[PDB]
Structures are given as C-alpha cells and as structure tokens.
Amino acid sequence: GLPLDERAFEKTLTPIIQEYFEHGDTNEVAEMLRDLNLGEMKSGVPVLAVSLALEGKASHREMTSKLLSDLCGTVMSTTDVEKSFDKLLKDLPELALDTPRAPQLVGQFIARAVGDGILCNTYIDSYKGTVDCVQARAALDKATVLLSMS
Ligand SMILES: [Cl-]
Ligand code: NA
C-alpha cells in the first residue's frame, strides 16, 4: 500500500548511498539495510539510489545497477525491485526537471535490471498500453530499444 517514514528514510539512506558511490562496497550498503530492517520501504532503496545516481557521474549509475543486482536476493526480493521501478516511473516527471535525460537513463536502468534477471522480461510489456505519462513511456521505449540490441 503506502510506505512509512519516507522523509526520514531519504535523510537516513542518502549519505549511505553517496558514500557507496565512493567506496564501491555493496556489502556495506547491505549491512546498513540489515540493521534498518525496512518494511515495504525496502522498495524505496533502488528508487533513491537511482535518483541520486541520475544527478551524479555515469560511473555512479553503473555502480547503482551493480548494487541493485547484489542487493536483490540478499536484503530484498524481485518483488521489491519491481515495486521500486514502478515508483521510479511515477517519479520520472519530477526527476526530469533536474535531469532532462532522466527518462533515457531510467531506460538503461530497466534494461540492465532485466539483463541481470532482477526484473521480469515481461515487466515492460505489461506497461505497453497502460501508461499515460509520456515520460514513463519514453523510459519504457528506451529500455525496449536497449534490450533489442542486447
Ligand atoms: Cl534510442
Ligand atoms: Na541491475
């Protein structure tokens, strides 16, 4: 349904993710998440990580895809991951204000998640003809293109 402690959540996880962009140890992030024992807010981690990476270096975005692959199956499930991308698609209109190419970059995050097997290959299809948001559509379309040339 609805997540709890969202505002505090962002305040607590942001420094942890930013630090990860520098040390590159996904196990450090995993330990912090085990300490927090997050409820449904588990799905909020990928969204925040992606959101911060969008405004960072291209290397941070690659490190983020790696983090998602590592965390899935350890501190969160594919179900949490799918919920995270659903949230990401919804936040796209706001994210694009700071990063115009956010849709395309989210497209790569989606393609990579499907490649790493943490996001079902039918995820994109399910949204085919169910999305009104042109930004979400652009992200899904970019993901489709990237997966065709995989
Ligand atoms: Cl393209
Ligand atoms: Na990934």
Side-chain angles (χ1 to χ4, degrees), residues 103-130:
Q104 293 64 45
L105 296 174
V106 165
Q108 180 55 290
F109 274 113
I110 291 173
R112 172 57 165 284
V114 171
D116 294 336
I118 62 176
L119 184 57
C120 182
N121 45 51
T122 65
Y123 179 72
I124 301 297
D125 290 309
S126 296
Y127 275 119
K128 196 174 188 302
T130 291

PDB file of all heavy atoms in Angstrom, residues 103-130:
ATOM      1  N   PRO A 103      14.581  10.104 -18.294  1.00  0.00           N
ATOM      2  CA  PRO A 103      13.819   9.008 -18.906  1.00  0.00           C
ATOM      3  C   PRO A 103      14.715   7.981 -19.596  1.00  0.00           C
ATOM      4  O   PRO A 103      14.550   6.770 -19.423  1.00  0.00           O
ATOM      5  CB  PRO A 103      12.913   9.731 -19.901  1.00  0.00           C
ATOM      6  CG  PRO A 103      12.704  11.065 -19.255  1.00  0.00           C
ATOM      7  CD  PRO A 103      14.089  11.409 -18.775  1.00  0.00           C
ATOM      8  N   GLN A 104      15.661   8.473 -20.384  1.00  0.00           N
ATOM      9  CA  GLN A 104      16.578   7.600 -21.101  1.00  0.00           C
ATOM     10  C   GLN A 104      17.499   6.855 -20.147  1.00  0.00           C
ATOM     11  O   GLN A 104      17.783   5.678 -20.353  1.00  0.00           O
ATOM     12  CB  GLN A 104      17.415   8.406 -22.094  1.00  0.00           C
ATOM     13  CG  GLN A 104      16.626   9.011 -23.253  1.00  0.00           C
ATOM     14  CD  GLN A 104      15.615  10.040 -22.800  1.00  0.00           C
ATOM     15  OE1 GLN A 104      15.915  10.897 -21.970  1.00  0.00           O
ATOM     16  NE2 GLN A 104      14.409   9.965 -23.350  1.00  0.00           N
ATOM     17  N   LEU A 105      17.967   7.539 -19.103  1.00  0.00           N
ATOM     18  CA  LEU A 105      18.852   6.902 -18.133  1.00  0.00           C
ATOM     19  C   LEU A 105      18.090   5.839 -17.336  1.00  0.00           C
ATOM     20  O   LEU A 105      18.650   4.799 -16.985  1.00  0.00           O
ATOM     21  CB  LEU A 105      19.464   7.955 -17.200  1.00  0.00           C
ATOM     22  CG  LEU A 105      20.374   8.981 -17.894  1.00  0.00           C
ATOM     23  CD1 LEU A 105      20.795  10.055 -16.905  1.00  0.00           C
ATOM     24  CD2 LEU A 105      21.599   8.286 -18.477  1.00  0.00           C
ATOM     25  N   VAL A 106      16.817   6.100 -17.049  1.00  0.00           N
ATOM     26  CA  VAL A 106      15.992   5.136 -16.331  1.00  0.00           C
ATOM     27  C   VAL A 106      15.782   3.954 -17.276  1.00  0.00           C
ATOM     28  O   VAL A 106      15.681   2.800 -16.846  1.00  0.00           O
ATOM     29  CB  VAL A 106      14.637   5.765 -15.912  1.00  0.00           C
ATOM     30  CG1 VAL A 106      13.641   4.689 -15.513  1.00  0.00           C
ATOM     31  CG2 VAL A 106      14.863   6.707 -14.735  1.00  0.00           C
ATOM     32  N   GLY A 107      15.730   4.254 -18.573  1.00  0.00           N
ATOM     33  CA  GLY A 107      15.575   3.213 -19.573  1.00  0.00           C
ATOM     34  C   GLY A 107      16.724   2.225 -19.478  1.00  0.00           C
ATOM     35  O   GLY A 107      16.521   1.016 -19.574  1.00  0.00           O
ATOM     36  N   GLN A 108      17.936   2.737 -19.289  1.00  0.00           N
ATOM     37  CA  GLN A 108      19.103   1.876 -19.163  1.00  0.00           C
ATOM     38  C   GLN A 108      19.033   1.085 -17.859  1.00  0.00           C
ATOM     39  O   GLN A 108      19.391  -0.093 -17.823  1.00  0.00           O
ATOM     40  CB  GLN A 108      20.391   2.698 -19.207  1.00  0.00           C
ATOM     41  CG  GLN A 108      21.655   1.855 -19.069  1.00  0.00           C
ATOM     42  CD  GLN A 108      21.727   0.739 -20.100  1.00  0.00           C
ATOM     43  OE1 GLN A 108      20.971  -0.230 -20.040  1.00  0.00           O
ATOM     44  NE2 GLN A 108      22.633   0.879 -21.057  1.00  0.00           N
ATOM     45  N   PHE A 109      18.570   1.721 -16.784  1.00  0.00           N
ATOM     46  CA  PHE A 109      18.459   1.011 -15.513  1.00  0.00           C
ATOM     47  C   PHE A 109      17.506  -0.163 -15.683  1.00  0.00           C
ATOM     48  O   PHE A 109      17.753  -1.254 -15.170  1.00  0.00           O
ATOM     49  CB  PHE A 109      17.952   1.940 -14.401  1.00  0.00           C
ATOM     50  CG  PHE A 109      19.044   2.712 -13.714  1.00  0.00           C
ATOM     51  CD1 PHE A 109      19.134   4.094 -13.850  1.00  0.00           C
ATOM     52  CD2 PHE A 109      20.000   2.051 -12.945  1.00  0.00           C
ATOM     53  CE1 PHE A 109      20.159   4.809 -13.235  1.00  0.00           C
ATOM     54  CE2 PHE A 109      21.026   2.756 -12.328  1.00  0.00           C
ATOM     55  CZ  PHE A 109      21.106   4.140 -12.474  1.00  0.00           C
ATOM     56  N   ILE A 110      16.418   0.057 -16.413  1.00  0.00           N
ATOM     57  CA  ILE A 110      15.443  -1.008 -16.637  1.00  0.00           C
ATOM     58  C   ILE A 110      16.025  -2.154 -17.461  1.00  0.00           C
ATOM     59  O   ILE A 110      15.897  -3.322 -17.091  1.00  0.00           O
ATOM     60  CB  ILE A 110      14.183  -0.469 -17.347  1.00  0.00           C
ATOM     61  CG1 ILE A 110      13.414   0.449 -16.397  1.00  0.00           C
ATOM     62  CG2 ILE A 110      13.296  -1.621 -17.785  1.00  0.00           C
ATOM     63  CD1 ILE A 110      12.257   1.171 -17.056  1.00  0.00           C
ATOM     64  N   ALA A 111      16.661  -1.815 -18.578  1.00  0.00           N
ATOM     65  CA  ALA A 111      17.257  -2.814 -19.458  1.00  0.00           C
ATOM     66  C   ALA A 111      18.288  -3.652 -18.711  1.00  0.00           C
ATOM     67  O   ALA A 111      18.335  -4.874 -18.852  1.00  0.00           O
ATOM     68  CB  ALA A 111      17.912  -2.129 -20.643  1.00  0.00           C
ATOM     69  N   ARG A 112      19.115  -2.981 -17.918  1.00  0.00           N
ATOM     70  CA  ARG A 112      20.152  -3.650 -17.148  1.00  0.00           C
ATOM     71  C   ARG A 112      19.558  -4.564 -16.075  1.00  0.00           C
ATOM     72  O   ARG A 112      20.078  -5.655 -15.825  1.00  0.00           O
ATOM     73  CB  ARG A 112      21.065  -2.596 -16.520  1.00  0.00           C
ATOM     74  CG  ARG A 112      22.079  -3.131 -15.533  1.00  0.00           C
ATOM     75  CD  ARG A 112      22.980  -4.200 -16.123  1.00  0.00           C
ATOM     76  NE  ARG A 112      24.133  -4.397 -15.254  1.00  0.00           N
ATOM     77  CZ  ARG A 112      25.159  -3.556 -15.191  1.00  0.00           C
ATOM     78  NH1 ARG A 112      25.176  -2.473 -15.958  1.00  0.00           N
ATOM     79  NH2 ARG A 112      26.147  -3.778 -14.336  1.00  0.00           N
ATOM     80  N   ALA A 113      18.479  -4.122 -15.439  1.00  0.00           N
ATOM     81  CA  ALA A 113      17.829  -4.932 -14.408  1.00  0.00           C
ATOM     82  C   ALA A 113      17.264  -6.195 -15.041  1.00  0.00           C
ATOM     83  O   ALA A 113      17.312  -7.273 -14.446  1.00  0.00           O
ATOM     84  CB  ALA A 113      16.713  -4.143 -13.727  1.00  0.00           C
ATOM     85  N   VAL A 114      16.718  -6.062 -16.246  1.00  0.00           N
ATOM     86  CA  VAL A 114      16.179  -7.222 -16.944  1.00  0.00           C
ATOM     87  C   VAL A 114      17.349  -8.133 -17.308  1.00  0.00           C
ATOM     88  O   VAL A 114      17.261  -9.354 -17.177  1.00  0.00           O
ATOM     89  CB  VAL A 114      15.413  -6.809 -18.222  1.00  0.00           C
ATOM     90  CG1 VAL A 114      15.045  -8.044 -19.037  1.00  0.00           C
ATOM     91  CG2 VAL A 114      14.145  -6.053 -17.839  1.00  0.00           C
ATOM     92  N   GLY A 115      18.451  -7.532 -17.742  1.00  0.00           N
ATOM     93  CA  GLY A 115      19.622  -8.311 -18.099  1.00  0.00           C
ATOM     94  C   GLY A 115      20.168  -9.093 -16.915  1.00  0.00           C
ATOM     95  O   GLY A 115      20.549 -10.257 -17.051  1.00  0.00           O
ATOM     96  N   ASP A 116      20.204  -8.453 -15.750  1.00  0.00           N
ATOM     97  CA  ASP A 116      20.706  -9.097 -14.540  1.00  0.00           C
ATOM     98  C   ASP A 116      19.708 -10.072 -13.932  1.00  0.00           C
ATOM     99  O   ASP A 116      20.006 -10.735 -12.936  1.00  0.00           O
ATOM    100  CB  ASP A 116      21.098  -8.046 -13.494  1.00  0.00           C
ATOM    101  CG  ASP A 116      22.277  -7.196 -13.935  1.00  0.00           C
ATOM    102  OD1 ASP A 116      23.065  -7.657 -14.788  1.00  0.00           O
ATOM    103  OD2 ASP A 116      22.425  -6.070 -13.413  1.00  0.00           O
ATOM    104  N   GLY A 117      18.520 -10.145 -14.524  1.00  0.00           N
ATOM    105  CA  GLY A 117      17.495 -11.055 -14.047  1.00  0.00           C
ATOM    106  C   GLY A 117      16.734 -10.678 -12.788  1.00  0.00           C
ATOM    107  O   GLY A 117      16.071 -11.534 -12.205  1.00  0.00           O
ATOM    108  N   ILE A 118      16.810  -9.419 -12.364  1.00  0.00           N
ATOM    109  CA  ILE A 118      16.100  -8.985 -11.161  1.00  0.00           C
ATOM    110  C   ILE A 118      14.796  -8.276 -11.494  1.00  0.00           C
ATOM    111  O   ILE A 118      14.104  -7.778 -10.606  1.00  0.00           O
ATOM    112  CB  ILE A 118      16.965  -8.046 -10.289  1.00  0.00           C
ATOM    113  CG1 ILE A 118      17.319  -6.771 -11.061  1.00  0.00           C
ATOM    114  CG2 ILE A 118      18.225  -8.777  -9.847  1.00  0.00           C
ATOM    115  CD1 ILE A 118      18.082  -5.750 -10.221  1.00  0.00           C
ATOM    116  N   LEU A 119      14.477  -8.236 -12.784  1.00  0.00           N
ATOM    117  CA  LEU A 119      13.255  -7.618 -13.283  1.00  0.00           C
ATOM    118  C   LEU A 119      12.769  -8.495 -14.436  1.00  0.00           C
ATOM    119  O   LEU A 119      13.500  -8.722 -15.402  1.00  0.00           O
ATOM    120  CB  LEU A 119      13.542  -6.197 -13.783  1.00  0.00           C
ATOM    121  CG  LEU A 119      12.340  -5.375 -14.256  1.00  0.00           C
ATOM    122  CD1 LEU A 119      11.309  -5.277 -13.138  1.00  0.00           C
ATOM    123  CD2 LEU A 119      12.804  -3.983 -14.671  1.00  0.00           C
ATOM    124  N   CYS A 120      11.539  -8.991 -14.329  1.00  0.00           N
ATOM    125  CA  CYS A 120      10.977  -9.866 -15.354  1.00  0.00           C
ATOM    126  C   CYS A 120      10.988  -9.270 -16.756  1.00  0.00           C
ATOM    127  O   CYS A 120      10.761  -8.077 -16.944  1.00  0.00           O
ATOM    128  CB  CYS A 120       9.544 -10.263 -14.988  1.00  0.00           C
ATOM    129  SG  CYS A 120       8.776 -11.390 -16.185  1.00  0.00           S
ATOM    130  N   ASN A 121      11.245 -10.125 -17.740  1.00  0.00           N
ATOM    131  CA  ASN A 121      11.288  -9.706 -19.132  1.00  0.00           C
ATOM    132  C   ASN A 121       9.925  -9.244 -19.640  1.00  0.00           C
ATOM    133  O   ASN A 121       9.828  -8.664 -20.719  1.00  0.00           O
ATOM    134  CB  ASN A 121      11.806 -10.853 -20.004  1.00  0.00           C
ATOM    135  CG  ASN A 121      11.170 -12.186 -19.653  1.00  0.00           C
ATOM    136  OD1 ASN A 121       9.946 -12.301 -19.571  1.00  0.00           O
ATOM    137  ND2 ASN A 121      12.001 -13.202 -19.450  1.00  0.00           N
ATOM    138  N   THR A 122       8.877  -9.494 -18.861  1.00  0.00           N
ATOM    139  CA  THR A 122       7.532  -9.086 -19.254  1.00  0.00           C
ATOM    140  C   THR A 122       7.134  -7.782 -18.573  1.00  0.00           C
ATOM    141  O   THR A 122       6.055  -7.247 -18.828  1.00  0.00           O
ATOM    142  CB  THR A 122       6.483 -10.157 -18.890  1.00  0.00           C
ATOM    143  OG1 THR A 122       6.406 -10.292 -17.466  1.00  0.00           O
ATOM    144  CG2 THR A 122       6.853 -11.497 -19.502  1.00  0.00           C
ATOM    145  N   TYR A 123       8.007  -7.273 -17.708  1.00  0.00           N
ATOM    146  CA  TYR A 123       7.735  -6.030 -16.988  1.00  0.00           C
ATOM    147  C   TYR A 123       7.382  -4.889 -17.933  1.00  0.00           C
ATOM    148  O   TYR A 123       6.397  -4.175 -17.724  1.00  0.00           O
ATOM    149  CB  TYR A 123       8.952  -5.620 -16.151  1.00  0.00           C
ATOM    150  CG  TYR A 123       8.758  -4.324 -15.399  1.00  0.00           C
ATOM    151  CD1 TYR A 123       7.912  -4.256 -14.291  1.00  0.00           C
ATOM    152  CD2 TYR A 123       9.400  -3.157 -15.808  1.00  0.00           C
ATOM    153  CE1 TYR A 123       7.711  -3.054 -13.610  1.00  0.00           C
ATOM    154  CE2 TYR A 123       9.206  -1.953 -15.141  1.00  0.00           C
ATOM    155  CZ  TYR A 123       8.362  -1.905 -14.045  1.00  0.00           C
ATOM    156  OH  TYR A 123       8.152  -0.709 -13.396  1.00  0.00           O
ATOM    157  N   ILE A 124       8.196  -4.716 -18.969  1.00  0.00           N
ATOM    158  CA  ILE A 124       7.989  -3.656 -19.948  1.00  0.00           C
ATOM    159  C   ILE A 124       6.683  -3.843 -20.710  1.00  0.00           C
ATOM    160  O   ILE A 124       5.938  -2.888 -20.914  1.00  0.00           O
ATOM    161  CB  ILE A 124       9.144  -3.601 -20.970  1.00  0.00           C
ATOM    162  CG1 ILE A 124      10.471  -3.353 -20.250  1.00  0.00           C
ATOM    163  CG2 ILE A 124       8.889  -2.492 -21.984  1.00  0.00           C
ATOM    164  CD1 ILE A 124      10.537  -2.028 -19.532  1.00  0.00           C
ATOM    165  N   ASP A 125       6.418  -5.078 -21.130  1.00  0.00           N
ATOM    166  CA  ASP A 125       5.199  -5.388 -21.870  1.00  0.00           C
ATOM    167  C   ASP A 125       3.943  -5.002 -21.100  1.00  0.00           C
ATOM    168  O   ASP A 125       3.043  -4.366 -21.647  1.00  0.00           O
ATOM    169  CB  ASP A 125       5.140  -6.879 -22.207  1.00  0.00           C
ATOM    170  CG  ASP A 125       6.156  -7.282 -23.254  1.00  0.00           C
ATOM    171  OD1 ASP A 125       6.204  -6.627 -24.317  1.00  0.00           O
ATOM    172  OD2 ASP A 125       6.899  -8.258 -23.017  1.00  0.00           O
ATOM    173  N   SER A 126       3.880  -5.391 -19.832  1.00  0.00           N
ATOM    174  CA  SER A 126       2.720  -5.086 -19.004  1.00  0.00           C
ATOM    175  C   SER A 126       2.358  -3.605 -19.041  1.00  0.00           C
ATOM    176  O   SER A 126       1.191  -3.243 -18.896  1.00  0.00           O
ATOM    177  CB  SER A 126       2.975  -5.520 -17.561  1.00  0.00           C
ATOM    178  OG  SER A 126       3.139  -6.925 -17.482  1.00  0.00           O
ATOM    179  N   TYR A 127       3.359  -2.753 -19.236  1.00  0.00           N
ATOM    180  CA  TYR A 127       3.136  -1.314 -19.299  1.00  0.00           C
ATOM    181  C   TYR A 127       2.823  -0.840 -20.711  1.00  0.00           C
ATOM    182  O   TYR A 127       2.586   0.344 -20.938  1.00  0.00           O
ATOM    183  CB  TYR A 127       4.360  -0.564 -18.777  1.00  0.00           C
ATOM    184  CG  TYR A 127       4.381  -0.391 -17.280  1.00  0.00           C
ATOM    185  CD1 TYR A 127       5.406  -0.932 -16.511  1.00  0.00           C
ATOM    186  CD2 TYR A 127       3.384   0.337 -16.632  1.00  0.00           C
ATOM    187  CE1 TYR A 127       5.441  -0.749 -15.132  1.00  0.00           C
ATOM    188  CE2 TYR A 127       3.410   0.526 -15.255  1.00  0.00           C
ATOM    189  CZ  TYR A 127       4.442  -0.020 -14.512  1.00  0.00           C
ATOM    190  OH  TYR A 127       4.479   0.175 -13.152  1.00  0.00           O
ATOM    191  N   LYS A 128       2.823  -1.769 -21.660  1.00  0.00           N
ATOM    192  CA  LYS A 128       2.539  -1.431 -23.048  1.00  0.00           C
ATOM    193  C   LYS A 128       1.036  -1.221 -23.233  1.00  0.00           C
ATOM    194  O   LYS A 128       0.284  -2.176 -23.422  1.00  0.00           O
ATOM    195  CB  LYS A 128       3.036  -2.551 -23.969  1.00  0.00           C
ATOM    196  CG  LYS A 128       3.158  -2.157 -25.431  1.00  0.00           C
ATOM    197  CD  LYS A 128       3.796  -3.271 -26.251  1.00  0.00           C
ATOM    198  CE  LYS A 128       4.097  -2.815 -27.673  1.00  0.00           C
ATOM    199  NZ  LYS A 128       2.876  -2.350 -28.388  1.00  0.00           N
ATOM    200  N   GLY A 129       0.604   0.033 -23.168  1.00  0.00           N
ATOM    201  CA  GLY A 129      -0.808   0.332 -23.332  1.00  0.00           C
ATOM    202  C   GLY A 129      -1.514   0.535 -22.006  1.00  0.00           C
ATOM    203  O   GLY A 129      -2.736   0.422 -21.917  1.00  0.00           O
ATOM    204  N   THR A 130      -0.736   0.840 -20.974  1.00  0.00           N
ATOM    205  CA  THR A 130      -1.267   1.065 -19.634  1.00  0.00           C
ATOM    206  C   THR A 130      -0.707   2.369 -19.064  1.00  0.00           C
ATOM    207  O   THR A 130      -1.105   2.816 -17.987  1.00  0.00           O
ATOM    208  CB  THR A 130      -0.901  -0.121 -18.703  1.00  0.00           C
ATOM    209  OG1 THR A 130      -1.632  -1.286 -19.109  1.00  0.00           O
ATOM    210  CG2 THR A 130      -1.226   0.193 -17.255  1.00  0.00           C
TER     211      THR A 130
END
